[PDB]
Amino acid sequence: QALKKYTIDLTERAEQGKLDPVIGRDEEIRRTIQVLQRRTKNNPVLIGEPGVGKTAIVEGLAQRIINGEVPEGLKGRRVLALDMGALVAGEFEERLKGVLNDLAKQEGNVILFIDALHTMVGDAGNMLKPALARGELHCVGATTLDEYRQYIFQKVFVAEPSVEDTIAILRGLKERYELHHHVQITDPAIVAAATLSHRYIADRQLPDKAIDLIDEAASSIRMQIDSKPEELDRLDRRIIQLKLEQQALMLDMLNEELSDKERQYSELEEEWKAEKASLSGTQTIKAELEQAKIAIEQARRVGDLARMSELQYGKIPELEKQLEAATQLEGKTMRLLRNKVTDAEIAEVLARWTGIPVSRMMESEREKLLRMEQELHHRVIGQNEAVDAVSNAIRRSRAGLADPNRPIGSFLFLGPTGVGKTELCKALANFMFDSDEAMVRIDMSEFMEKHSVSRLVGAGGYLTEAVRRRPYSVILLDAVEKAHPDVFNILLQVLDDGRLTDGQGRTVDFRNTVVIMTSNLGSDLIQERFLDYAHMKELVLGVVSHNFRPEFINRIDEVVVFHPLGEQHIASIAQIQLKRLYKRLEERGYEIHISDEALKLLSENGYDPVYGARPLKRAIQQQIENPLAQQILSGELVPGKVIRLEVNEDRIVAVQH
Numbered sequence: 199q200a201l202k203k204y205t206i207d208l209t210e211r212a213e214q215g216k217l218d219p220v221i222g223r224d225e226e227i228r229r230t231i232q233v234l235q236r237r238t239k240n241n242p243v244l245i246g247e248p249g250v251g252k253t254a255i256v257e258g259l260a261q262r263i264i265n266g267e268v269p270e271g272l273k274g275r276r277v278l279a280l281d282m283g284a285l286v287a288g289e290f291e292e293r294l295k296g297v298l299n300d301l302a303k304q305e306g307n308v309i310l311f312i313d314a315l316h317t318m319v320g321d322a323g324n325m326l327k328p329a330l331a332r333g334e335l336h337c338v339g340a341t342t343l344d345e346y347r348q349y350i351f352q353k354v355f356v357a358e359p360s361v362e363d364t365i366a367i368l369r370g371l372k373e374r375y376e377l378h379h380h381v382q383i384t385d386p387a388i389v390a391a392a393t394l395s396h397r398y399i400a401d402r403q404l405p406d407k408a409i410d411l412i413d414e415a416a417s418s419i420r421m422q423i424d425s426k427p428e429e430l431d432r433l434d435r436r437i438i439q440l441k442l443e444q445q446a447l448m449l450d451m452l453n454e455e456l457s458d459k460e461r462q463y464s465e466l467e468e469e470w471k472a473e474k475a476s477l478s479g480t481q482t483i484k485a486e487l488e489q490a491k492i493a494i495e496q497a498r499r500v501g502d503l504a505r506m507s508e509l510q511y512g513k514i515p516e517l518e519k520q521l522e523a524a525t526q527l528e529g530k531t532m533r534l535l536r537n538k539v540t541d542a543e544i545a546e547v548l549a550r551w552t553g554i555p556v557s558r559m560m561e562s563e564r565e566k567l568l569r570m571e572q573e574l575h576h577r578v579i580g581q582n583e584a585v586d587a588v589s590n591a592i593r594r595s596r597a598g599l600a601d602p603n604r605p606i607g608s609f610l611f612l613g614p615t616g617v618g619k620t621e622l623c624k625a626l627a628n629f630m631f632d633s634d635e636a637m638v639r640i641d642m643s644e645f646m647e648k649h650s651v652s653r654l655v656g657a658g659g660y661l662t663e664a665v666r667r668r669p670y671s672v673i674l675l676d677a678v679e680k681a682h683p684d685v686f687n688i689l690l691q692v693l694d695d696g697r698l699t700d701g702q703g704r705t706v707d708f709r710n711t712v713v714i715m716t717s718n719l720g721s722d723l724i725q726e727r728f729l730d731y732a733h734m735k736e737l738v739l740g741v742v743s744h745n746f747r748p749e750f751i752n753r754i755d756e757v758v759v760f761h762p763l764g765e766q767h768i769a770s771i772a773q774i775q776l777k778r779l780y781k782r783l784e785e786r787g788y789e790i791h792i793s794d795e796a797l798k799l800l801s802e803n804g805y806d807p808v809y810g811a812r813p814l815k816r817a818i819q820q821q822i823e824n825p826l827a828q829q830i831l832s833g834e835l836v837p838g839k840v841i842r843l844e845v846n847e848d849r850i851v852a853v854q855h
C-alpha cells in the first residue's frame with residue numbers, strides 16, 4: 199500500500215465533490231480517453247506549457263469516470279496522482295518498486311498520473327521501463343514539450359485557451375472561488391482578469407495567470423473586509439484626542455461634543471457588527487448550498503430516492519432563494535464593507551505586478567483614438583499625411599470595419615532618411631502599446647539569404663519568438679526591398695492569416711500587432727517632388743510596381759509617403775530634442791532658454807538632405823551638452839540662475855546674465 203503513502207486518489211476526491219469544475223477541454227478529454235483504451239502504446243501524455251490546465255484535464259477525466267460518462271471500459275477505474283514529494287522524504291528506488299507492485303496488483307483498474315513526467319525518467323528512475331511494455335502499469339503523463347523533446351506513449355497536445363475560453367473557464371470556477379474567498383466576484387472582473395493578464399503578463403500563461411489575478415484581488419478584498427473601517431478609526435482617534443484635552447483641562451462644551459461623538463461612534467460600531475453578521479450569514483448558507491449540491495451528486499451515484507427530489511425541489515432552490523435574498527440584503531445593508539471584487543481590483547493587482555500606472559490600463563480608448571493625430575503630433579513633427587493615413591487605418595481596424603484575422607495595421611513607409619519614419623513607429627508603439635519598448639525592430643539588410651528566411655522563422659526564429667513574448671508590439675521591417683524572396687511569402691502569410699506557423703509547427707498570433715515596412719526606393723522621386731499634395735502616391739506607385747507584386751500593394755492598408763523637412767520643421771525637431779536636456783536640468787534647478795539664432799545654428803548643423811535630421815541629436819550633444827557639462831562641473835554655472843544659450847562668434851555659448 200505505497201499508494202496510500204505515495205499517491206493522491208483523484209477519483210476519490212472527485213467522488214467527494216472536492217475537485218473544482220472543469221470547463222471546456224471536451225476534445226482533449228475525449229482524446230485522452232480514446233488513447234487510454236489504446237491497443238498498444240495506450241497510455242497518453244499531456245504536453246503543454248505550465249498553467250494551461252493539463253492537470254485540469256486529468257481531474258476532468260476523473261470526474262467523468264465518477265459520473266459514469268466514460269466508455270464501459272473505463273467505468274469503475276481509479277485515477278491516482280503520484281506525488282514526487284513523498285518519495286524523496288536508496289529509499290527512492292525501493293518505494294517506487296513497491297508502488298509498481300501495488301499498481302501491478304489490481305492489473306488495470308488503476309490509472310497512474312505523473313506530473314512533470316521528465317523528473318521520474320530523465321532523477322531518471324530506470325525501473326519504470328519494464329512496466330510500460332509488460333503492461334503492469336497504465337499511466338498518463340503531464341510534461342512540457344521541451345521535456346518531451348528530452349524524453350523522445352502517445353502524444354496528446356494541450357493548447358493554451360484563448361481569452362474567450364479563459365472567460366468561460368473563470369465563469370465556471372466563479373461560484374467555487376466566491377465560496378473559497380468569502381467574496382463576490384464581478385463578471386467585469388472576470389473579463390478584465392483574462393484580458394489584462396493576456397495583454398500585460400508576457401511570461402505566464404492562460405488561464406493560470408488570470409486565475410492568479412482573481413485570487414490575489416480576492417485576498418486583497420478579504421483583508422479589506424476584516425479590517426476596521428476608516429470612519430471608526432477616525433472617530434476613535436478624534437474622541438481619544440478630545441478625551442485627552444478634556445481630562446487635561448480638569449471646559450464642559452467639549453464634554454457635550456465628546457458624548458455626541460461617542461453616540462455616533464457607538465452607532466457606527468454597531469452598524470459595523472451588523473454588516474459583518476450579514477456577510478457571515480451569506481457565506482454560511484452559500485457553503486450549505488454547495489454541500490447540498492454535492493450531496494445530490496452523491497445521491498445520483500448511490501441511488502437514494504425521495505432524497506434527490508427533496509433536494510432538487512426543496513433544499514437547493516430554497517437555499518438559492520435566500521442566498522440571493524441575502525445578497526440583495528447585502529445590497530441594502532452593505533456600506534462600510536465592500537465584498538465585491540471588480541475590474542478595478544484586478545487592475546490594482548496587475549498594477550502591483552507590472553508597474554503600469556493603471557490610469558493607462560483603463561484610460562478611455564475612444565478618446566485616445568479620436569484625438570490620435572494630436573497625440574502622434576506631440577512627438578512626430580510634420581508629416582501630416584503619414585499621421586492621417588496611420589490614424590485612419592488604425593481607427594478603421596479598432597472600429598471593427600476590417601478583417602479581424604489580419605494585423606491591426608499594415609503600412610509601407612516611403613521617403614528619404616531622417617524624416618521621422620522610425621519616429622512615427624516609436625510614437626505608435628508608445629501611443630497604443632504604452633511604450634517604445636513594445637516594438638520589434640528587424641533590419642531586412644541582414645536577411646538577404648535562404649539562411650534569412652531560416653533565421654527569422656526557424657528550421658528559434660528572431661520574429662516568432664519576439665511576437666510570442668510580446669503579442670502587442672509595433673513590428674518595424676526596415677529596408678524591406680533588400681529582403682530575400684522567400685521572406686516576402688512569410689510576410690504575406692502574416693498580412694493575411696494574421697498568424698504565422700514557425701519551423702516548430704506552432705502558430706504565432708500577429709493580430710495584435712501593427713506591421714510597418716520602410717523603403718528607400720521612392721526616395722529620389724519623392725525628394726524630386728514638391729507637384730500636388732496628392733498625385734505623389736500615383737507617381738511613386740509607378741516605382742512601387744517595379745519591385746513589388748500586386749499582392750503586396752493590395753494587402754497593405756496604406757502606402758505612406760514621407761516628405762523632406764522644412765526649416766521650421768527642423769527647428770521644432772530641435773526644440774523637442776532640447777526638451778529632455780531641459781528636463782534633466784530642471785531637476786537640478788537649472789533654467790535654460792535658447793536664442794533664436796542659436797536655435798538656427800543647431801538647425802543648420804543638424805540637417806543635411808541625405809541623412810535628414812539624424813545628425814541633430816549628437817549635433818546638440820557636441821555643441822551644447824559638452825561645454826554645458828564643462829561649466830556645470832566648473833561651478834561657473836550655478837542653479838537658481840537662468841542659463842541663456844547664445845552665439846559667440848559662430849559657436850554656441852552658455853551664459854548667466
Ligand SMILES: Nc1ncnc2c1ncn2[C@@H]1O[C@H](COP(=O)(O)OP(=O)(O)O)[C@@H](O)[C@H]1O
Pocket residue numbers: 218219220221222223246247248249250251252253254255340367370371405406409
Ligand atoms: N478547462 C478548465 N476548467 C477549469 N479550470 C481550468 C481549466 N483549465 C485550467 N484550469 C485551471 O488552471 C489552473 C492551473 O492549471 P494546471 O492544471 O496547473 O496547468 P498545468 O498542470 O497544465 O501546468 C488550475 O487551477 C485549473 O483549475
Ligand SMILES: Nc1ncnc2c1ncn2[C@@H]1O[C@H](COP(=O)(O)OP(=O)(O)O)[C@@H](O)[C@H]1O
Pocket residue numbers: 577578579580581614615616617618619620621622771775810811812814
Ligand atoms: N518628423 C520628425 N519628428 C520628430 N523627430 C524627428 C522627425 N524626423 C527626424 N526626427 C529625429 O531624427 C532622428 C532620426 O530620425 P528617424 O526617425 O530615425 O529617421 P528614419 O525613420 O528615416 O530612420 C530621430 O531620433 C528623431 O528624434
